[PDB]
Amino acid sequence: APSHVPFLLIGGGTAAFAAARSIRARDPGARVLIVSEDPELPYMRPPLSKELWFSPNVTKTLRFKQWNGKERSIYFQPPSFYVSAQDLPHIENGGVAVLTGKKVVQLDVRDNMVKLNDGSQITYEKCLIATGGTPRSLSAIDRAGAEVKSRTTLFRKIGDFRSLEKISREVKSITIIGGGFLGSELACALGRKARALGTEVIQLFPEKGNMGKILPEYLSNWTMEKVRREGVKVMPNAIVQSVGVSSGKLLIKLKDGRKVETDHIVAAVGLEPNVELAKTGGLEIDSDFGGFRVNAELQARSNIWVAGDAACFYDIKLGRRRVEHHDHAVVSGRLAGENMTGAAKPYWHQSMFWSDLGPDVGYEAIGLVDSSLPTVGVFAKATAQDNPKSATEQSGTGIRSESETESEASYGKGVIFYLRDKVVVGIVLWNIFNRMPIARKIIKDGEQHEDLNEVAKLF
Numbered sequence: 001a002p003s004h005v006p007f008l009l010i011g012g013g014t015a016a017f018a019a020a021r022s023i024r025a026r027d028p029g030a031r032v033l034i035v036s037e038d039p040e041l042p043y044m045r046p047p048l049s050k051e052l053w054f055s056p057n058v059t060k061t062l063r064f065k066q067w068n069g070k071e072r073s074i075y076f077q078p079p080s081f082y083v084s085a086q087d088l089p090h091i092e093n094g095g096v097a098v099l100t101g102k103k104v105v106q107l108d109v110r111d112n113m114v115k116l117n118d119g120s121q122i123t124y125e126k127c128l129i130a131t132g133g134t135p136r137s138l139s140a141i142d143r144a145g146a147e148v149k150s151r152t153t154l155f156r157k158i159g160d161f162r163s164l165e166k167i168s169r170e171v172k173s174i175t176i177i178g179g180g181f182l183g184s185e186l187a188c189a190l191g192r193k194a195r196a197l198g199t200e201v202i203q204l205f206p207e208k209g210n211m212g213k214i215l216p217e218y219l220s221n222w223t224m225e226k227v228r229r230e231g232v233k234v235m236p237n238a239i240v241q242s243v244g245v246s247s248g249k250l251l252i253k254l255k256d257g258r259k260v261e262t263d264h265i266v267a268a269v270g271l272e273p274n275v276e277l278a279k280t281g282g283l284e285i286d287s288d289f290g291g292f293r294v295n296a297e298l299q300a301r302s303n304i305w306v307a308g309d310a311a312c313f314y315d316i317k318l319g320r321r322r323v324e325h326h327d328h329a330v331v332s333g334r335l336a337g338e339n340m341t342g343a344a345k346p347y348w349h350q351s352m353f354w355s356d357l358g359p360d361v362g363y364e365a366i367g368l369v370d371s372s373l374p375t376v377g378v379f380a381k382a383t384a385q386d387n388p389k390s391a392t393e394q395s396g397t398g399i400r401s402e403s404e405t406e407s408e409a410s411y412g413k414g415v416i417f418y419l420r421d422k423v424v425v426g427i428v429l430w431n432i433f434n435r436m437p438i439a440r441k442i443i444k445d446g447e448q449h450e451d452l453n454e455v456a457k458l459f
């Protein structure tokens with residue numbers, strides 16, 4: 001670990017990598033150090049709940065096959081592209097180094113320095129906090145003791161992919177708690193594995209259907225049927241009361257009286273932004289939405305920026321906000337990098353989200369998407385190209401935010417408009433690809449729409 005580094009990136013995920021790339025692009029000789037608590041070099045997360053499950057050496061290499069059959073590495077860059085932390089301070093033309101297995105435990109804003117868990121002290125000139133978040137657990141699990149806890153997976157990293165993939169091959173029943181996109185993706189991934197093995201997969205949540213807090217009743221229900229068609233036993237309207245061990249089996253007790261016996265549990269119930277450094281750093285966090293509060297240029301302080309899942313930014317349309325989008329991590333990380341190199345540009349990007357439940361069904365979302373808001377959905381029969389696989393064959397990539405582009409324009413599918421009076425504040429696209437720029441334009445203009453069935457023609 002160097003005693004000093006010009007650019008210090010705390011956390012080694014998607015946002016940090018984007019910032020590292022941006023800093024180097026604007027400053028060819030920049031010296032950038034990434035401190036990552038995890039043992040792995042920077043990698044993208046979407047494949048962990050998708051393509052990596054649709055394949056035995058893949059678990060070792062982590063080089064997956066996209067829906068189009070072509071391989072891609074989960075890592076942002078090959079390990080030989082990074083320089084050693086030891087050489088970073090004076091190596092010719094600089095570079096980007098990564099300190100894996102090390103965690104920043106103290107931040108001293110006034111002295112521009114951080115302390116690592118091993119006692120190491122590092123000063124910086126410009127710092128980016130890109131710590132992401134920590135998965136949330138169920139209070140029922142927290143209050144159940146060590147045994148139950150040891151048999152519950154909080155899905156987020158490469159290590160969770162490997163341990164869960166192992167378990168799916170070794171046990172007879174796995175239960176997923178959570179109806180969100182991630183829980184549903186895992187449900188489909190695990191369901192397919194179970195079909196060949198002849199095992200069981202259960203998914204339960206308090207809502208009436210999958211993604212119930214986001215999707216309107218019609219599409220929420222359609223999604224639940226989709227998951228059931230994969231062999232998964234889906235249990236909606238399920239409120240967990242307690243969880244314990246009975247005769248070596250996990251026993252989940254629900255409020256309506258139902259009891260569920262299973263071998264392992266996977267929880268996908270949201271995340272808690274990692275703002276532990278706010279304590280010693282004396283930085284302000286948002287008690288309502290979570291995360292480090294930053295200004296328009298993503299600054300927490302004159303020389304400290306925040307990007308990705310850990311940032312509570314000011315959405316140009318919605319006010320204080322925090323999101324969990326790959327697109328956001330990439331764009332905000334890139335911007336932070338540019339601002340750390342004298343750009344002084346505001347974050348006005350409208351972050352998009354995407355989810356693939358296999359090669360045949362996908363979703364895209366943007367803006368305020370809440371099922372409690374008044375909505376208007378327009379649907380139609382899907383064509384042969386309206387699916388994630390075709391979209392990937394066309395674009396050559398499975399990372400939707402890449403093929404969709406970051407710009408704004410100048411039944412088996414459909415569009416769902418979320419409204420505020422007659423203005424569209426959010427949009428969900430079901431099996432419609434390469435039209436996000438149109439969605440961004442509609443939301444940005446913020447005009448009132450007398451029809452919408454006319455607007456749907458745009459998609």
Ligand SMILES: Cc1cc2nc3c(=O)[nH]c(=O)nc-3n(C[C@H](O)[C@H](O)[C@H](O)COP(=O)(O)OP(=O)(O)OC[C@H]3O[C@@H](n4cnc5c(N)ncnc54)[C@H](O)[C@@H]3O)c2cc1C
Binds near residue numbers: 010013130
């Ligand atoms: C399984 C899965 C699937 C997903 N699929 C999609 C998808 O299809 N579409 C989409 O739009 N989004 C998706 N997302 C979400 C998207 O991946 C995230 O928004 C993005 O990864 C966040 O990046 P980040 O850099 O902000 O944080 P992270 O990638 O979470 O990483 C933060 C890093 O910093 C480390 N760290 C934390 N604290 C410290 C510390 N004190 N010192 C050192 N290191 C620290 C962490 O351990 C971690 O390595 C998915 C997420 C998961 C988990």
